Structure 1
Amino acid sequence: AREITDIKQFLELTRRADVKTATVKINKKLNKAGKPFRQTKFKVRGSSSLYTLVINDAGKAKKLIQSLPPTLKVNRL
């Protein structure tokens, strides 16, 4: 239900010991009017709400996928 703009807040959430499931979604949307590009959404399941993180530039996204803790169960697409 919530949206998060910060990256380090999302990394604080992934280690909160209630978050058991996360998921990565890959959308295919178009920038300003011209071109298709690749959006990603990182959705972690807190026990009350479902927090998300919208990353448009994938050069942060590959670093962030690598930066997830490996104990977290990740649904990829």
Structure 2
Amino acid sequence: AREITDIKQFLELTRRADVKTATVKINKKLNKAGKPFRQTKFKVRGSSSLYTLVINDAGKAKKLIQSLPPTLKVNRL
């Protein structure tokens, strides 16, 4: 139910030992007024809180997904 924005604090979260599962979501939404763009939402699930980090930037998106700990059960989409 929480929202995160510090990309660091996010990664730390993803390695928080009680965090067994995440889930990436992708959304087509428009940019400013005109064309579209791909939004992505990173959702780490904690014992109590479900944190979700929105990378509006398709690039920081891709490079973030490799940073995801190999032992985290990502559900893609």
TM category, shorter? over 0.9
CA RMSD in angstroms, aligned pairs only = 0.5
Spell out the pairing of 1:1-77 with structure 2 (5 A cutoff): 1-77=1-77
**Deviation for aligned residue 1:12:** 0.5
Q: Distance between the aligned counterparts of 1:51 and 1:62, measured in 2?
A: 19
What is the CA distance between 1:62 and its match in structure 2? 0.7
Count of residue correspondences: 77
Calculate percent identity across the aligned residue pairs: 100
Deviation of 1:21 after TM superposition, in Å, equals 0.5
Listed one character per residue, the Cα deviations across residues 23-64 of structure 1 (whole Å, up to 9, x for unaligned) are 000000001110111000000000101001000111101110
Q: Distance in 1 between matches of 2:9 and 2:68?
A: 13
**Where does structure 1 lack aligned partners over 5 or more consecutive residues?**
none
What do the CA deviations read for 1:3-36 (whole angstroms, capped 9, x no partner)?
0010000011011100011000000000111011
Question: TM-score normalised to the size of structure 1?
Answer: 0.98
Q: Distance in 2 between matches of 1:66 and 1:15?
A: 14
- Residues in 1 aligned to 2:18 and 2:50: alpha-carbon distance in whole angstroms: 12
TM-score (norm: length of structure 2): 0.98
